[PDB]
Design a binder for these strands. Structure first.
Length: 106
RNA sequence: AAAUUAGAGUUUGGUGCUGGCUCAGCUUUCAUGCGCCGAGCGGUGGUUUAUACACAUGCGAGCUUAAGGCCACGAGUGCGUAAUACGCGAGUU
RNA sequence: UACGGUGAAGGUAACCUCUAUUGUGCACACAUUGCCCGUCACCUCCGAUAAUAGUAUUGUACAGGAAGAACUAUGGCUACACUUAGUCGCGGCCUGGAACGUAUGCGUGAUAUUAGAGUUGGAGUAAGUCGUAACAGGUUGGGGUAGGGGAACCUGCUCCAGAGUC
RNA sequence: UGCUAGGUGACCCAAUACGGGCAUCGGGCAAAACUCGCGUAGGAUUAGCGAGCUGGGUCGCUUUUUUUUUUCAGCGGCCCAUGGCUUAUCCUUAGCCUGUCUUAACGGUACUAGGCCACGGUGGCACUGAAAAGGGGCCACGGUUCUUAUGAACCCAGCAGUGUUGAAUUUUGGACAAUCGCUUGAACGGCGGAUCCAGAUGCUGCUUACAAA
RNA sequence: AUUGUUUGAACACCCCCCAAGCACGUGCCAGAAGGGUCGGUAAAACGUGCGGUGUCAGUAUAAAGCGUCUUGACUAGGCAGGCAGCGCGUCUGAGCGUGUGAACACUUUAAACGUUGGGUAAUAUUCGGAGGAUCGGUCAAAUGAGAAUAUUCCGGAUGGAAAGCCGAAGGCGAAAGCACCAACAUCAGAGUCACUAAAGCUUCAACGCGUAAGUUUGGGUAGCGAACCGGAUUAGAGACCCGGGUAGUCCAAACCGUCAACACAUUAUAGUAAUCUAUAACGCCUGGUGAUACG
């Protein structure tokens, strides 16, 4: 019709998580095991995890469950759920695998 | 006898817009936990999805009257290629 | 607390107020102690950028230039067949040179890659902090182009009224 | 050119009687190979194409073979007409189409099987063949081993299987019986990791309490 | 043909979306969540038991593709008003095209455009005279003109700015814009009356116009008004305001070309001045913060 619209229509098939790189689960080595204080109106000290991942890039990961056993040089499996209460963090450490196993009496 | 269009929550003192996020849909993985692994008949499906990475070992093209006669079909992958490609349509020296 | 005896002074200009009535503006509703501003401050996070250590690919200057080799060859060697016994051989097989043709070397270009010296920006963050941009909003602001200041910024000149309001 | 049937043999094999191979001829249909008409990812932070970049003549372009008639191309050498394109070139992504999933449809996007192309660790090249190379030939590269170091041998994008990476990837199974292919004139012959059957493993459709005839 | 009786086991969820609720536990701690979020001492979300809903040898989480999403709109968004009309024009692209567009003769139009000559209310400086302490200025205060004569006032010179009223919800323009005349001058636009029989529409690309600032060149300059020094509401004050005033505003030539350059109303045709809207070519947007750095 209008030929500008005729040329007006393959884009970037954008992975909405750009750290798993299209995959669901990538393992990695925990660089640092640390906690932080969250955005108000939350004030409970949430425990996080900076991981050197499989793809050579780094992003922060939520640590779930009643405590954990992760230290330096420790391998985990990282999942794709985010934690909302601090900005910019999109990763969840799944439990039922490696040095991070399940809590006692869940 | 032609078989053909689902929304909701989220913004604000409330109302309506404005577009975005999410959940409920279908399909999909030797995905990841937790649980069973009774036995049979089957369909099928893995692009070892990636590495066109390095391959131990064994086998995959030998047949036949020393000599000669026949073994370019099958299998795998997508490096390269944006066009002697591939598809469609006409005519062939 | 109650009940009488006497008993006057004294009054309308936003002249504050405490409203209403209202009908002109807000980005306020925790309803102007708001919404919310930035220089910065400790840190965290993808940028953007890059001297370079360079490796991966190609054009071009020439040496080359292997295996091959377009061309060139009659040095051949042999039968077919024809010569009644050396002839003959249009035609089949064989030492020969060679343009060209990789990989390759010091020059010297392209696209591409991360390593990264090193600088700066965006964003994120509960309590370090200096002033009033913004709103009747207190100098009426700004699209524009240049100046001046520890900071928010202001100085001109046409516009737009998408600030109030008679 | 390649297959199948015929017809021929001053050939070879078999034959208590006759058919095969082997050479040649020709009927049938056939592949192959080329050509052009169109389609086709984005990028101006690719704007001129560093080029014969297109055309005309001349040759070279390695065979005559049934009646009136018959045989491509810049592919190379030479002149020559000076033009040809302008999403032209250049970059980077990417095998392509049908498919499969979804949508009500138009569309949008990982497979099924299968169509075609490309490639065989990298690059160059040739023989033969009508047509060229995935376990054929030669050289150079890059790997892997060994040498008394001088040099040789090999290249799983074939099957199983090993190792890295990965969240994840299977049995070093059986078999020529069925196809189908190659081959052989006996012999239900020989071989085939094609395939057919079994495994592990996602999805599925479909049963499942024992006893007894 | 023969005979006996029967519903497992888990996983997730149970505030709303979304079917399902209570107890103790701990009280912005341990925690969960896809979103709104709940916990800040009486938790219908988090520790556990009970009870219930979904699916069932499966179930939830994670991802990925499509749809929902008209969320790139052809079916099917739009673009003053959230985000979206390029500042305007010339324009043989492509596309849409059976009376529009253009030149002539009259009627009528003015701030349309450039050049040349002349003028002006008014302006500060100056040459002599009147006159002897105020003027300037502001809500208010403060450097100075001035004991050499200030505001003023007389009359004279200077030299260029700007066109003071007209003059207005008035005109001309494509837009920016355009406001002393007189003349040259080149248009333009409207109406009448005639020619012409699509030469029409749009503008990708290109290209011009382009208020004002700013820079190069030449000078000199009524008024205007950045620096530099002086004083003020206030604690510092660099601003608002008072006080002198340089480049620039003035001219002639060039470069720049960007902007709430707005009808924020694309252009054109067809209807009665559109934001009533069918179409023709367009240009632009795709949640916010992030447009700055390279080329």
């Amino acid at each position: 019709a209008t030929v500008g619209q005729l040329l007006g229509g393959a884009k970037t098939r954008k992975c909405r998580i750009r750290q798993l790189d299209g995959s669901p689960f990538k393992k990695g080595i925990c660089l640092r095991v640390y906690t932080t204080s969250p955005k108000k109106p939350n004030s409970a000290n949430r425990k996080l995890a900076k991981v050197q991942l499989s793809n050579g890039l780094k992003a922060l990961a939520y640590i779930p469950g009643e405590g954990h056993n992760l230290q330096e040089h420790s391998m985990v499996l990282v999942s794709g759920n985010g934690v909302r209460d601090l900005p910019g963090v999109k990763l969840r450490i799944v439990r039922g695998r490696y040095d991070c196993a399940g809590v006692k009496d869940r």
